[PDB]
Design an enzyme around this catalytic site. Structure first.
Site, PDB file in Angstrom:
ATOM      1  N   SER A  13      85.917 -14.611  10.217  1.00 34.62           N
ATOM      2  CA  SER A  13      86.827 -14.655  11.371  1.00 34.62           C
ATOM      3  C   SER A  13      86.251 -15.533  12.448  1.00 34.62           C
ATOM      4  O   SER A  13      87.005 -16.223  13.125  1.00 34.62           O
ATOM      5  CB  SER A  13      87.001 -13.298  12.016  1.00 34.62           C
ATOM      6  OG  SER A  13      87.661 -12.415  11.161  1.00 34.62           O
TER       7      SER A  13
ATOM      8  N   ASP B  53      85.285  10.381  21.099  1.00 31.44           N
ATOM      9  CA  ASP B  53      86.071   9.211  20.814  1.00 31.44           C
ATOM     10  C   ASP B  53      86.876   9.405  19.524  1.00 31.44           C
ATOM     11  O   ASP B  53      86.846  10.477  18.929  1.00 31.44           O
ATOM     12  CB  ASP B  53      85.320   7.865  20.968  1.00 31.44           C
ATOM     13  CG  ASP B  53      84.360   7.550  19.849  1.00 31.44           C
ATOM     14  OD1 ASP B  53      83.658   6.565  19.832  1.00 31.44           O
ATOM     15  OD2 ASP B  53      84.343   8.432  18.876  1.00 31.44           O
TER      16      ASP B  53
ATOM     17  N   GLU C 172      90.619   1.428  26.828  1.00 34.52           N
ATOM     18  CA  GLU C 172      89.717   2.550  26.765  1.00 34.52           C
ATOM     19  C   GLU C 172      90.136   3.749  27.559  1.00 34.52           C
ATOM     20  O   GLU C 172      89.673   4.823  27.261  1.00 34.52           O
ATOM     21  CB  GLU C 172      88.334   2.127  27.337  1.00 34.52           C
ATOM     22  CG  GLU C 172      87.572   1.024  26.592  1.00 34.52           C
ATOM     23  CD  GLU C 172      87.163   1.396  25.195  1.00 34.52           C
ATOM     24  OE1 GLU C 172      86.887   0.544  24.348  1.00 34.52           O
ATOM     25  OE2 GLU C 172      87.143   2.697  24.982  1.00 34.52           O
TER      26      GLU C 172
END
Ligand SMILES: [Cl-]
Ligand SMILES: [Cl-]
EC number: 3.2.1.17
Length: 162
Positions: free
Chosen positions: A117, A20, A11
């Protein structure tokens, strides 16, 4: 290597409001402020979050304080989620980090949506989960971060971060 150092790598750290990758106002270490296009609505949320008139700028200390909360919030959401908890309990320490990483970036709800997943991780089918995790908007949008997270799940080591 621990979750805090991992996330600080993924980050970065910014002391001024920034956008972002998705164009949302963020501050510090990946702390999403608002999805609203208004810079004033970001500055509002920011002052609410800090307890002071920040004029869009915070100290390192303030940033790490938000980081401690978000990591805590991330872990707690995992443990509160009926879908996520069983997967987390089934994993080792490194892989636990990897799931926390995902939840921090994408929210519990988002991660919870990776049904196939998760199922593959719970059954410890590493290589297959890695392939399935890559077929996502997530991987396409933040491919280098995603490969690092994916590798962590595949290998079960911190190599992608060394
Ligand atoms: Cl907050
Ligand atoms: Cl990336």
């Amino acid at each position: 290597m621990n979750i805090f150092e991992m996330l600080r790598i993924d980050e970065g750290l910014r002391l001024k409001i920034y956008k972002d990758t998705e164009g949302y106002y963020t501050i510090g270490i990946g702390h999403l402020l608002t999805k609203s296009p208004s810079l004033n609505a970001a500055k509002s949320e920011l002052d609410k979050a800090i307890g002071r008139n920040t004029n869009g700028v915070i100290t390192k200390d303030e940033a790490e304080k938000l980081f401690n909360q978000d990591v805590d919030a991330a872990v707690r959401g995992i443990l509160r989620n009926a879908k996520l908890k069983p997967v987390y309990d089934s994993l080792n320490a490194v892989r636990r980090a990897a799931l926390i990483n995902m939840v921090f970036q994408m929210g519990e709800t988002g991660v919870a949506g990776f049904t196939n997943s998760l199922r593959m991780l719970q059954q410890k089918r590493w290589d297959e989960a890695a392939v399935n995790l890559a077929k996502s908007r997530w991987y396409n949008q933040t491919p280098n971060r995603a490969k690092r997270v994916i590798t962590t799940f595949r290998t079960g080591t911190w190599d992608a971060y060394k």
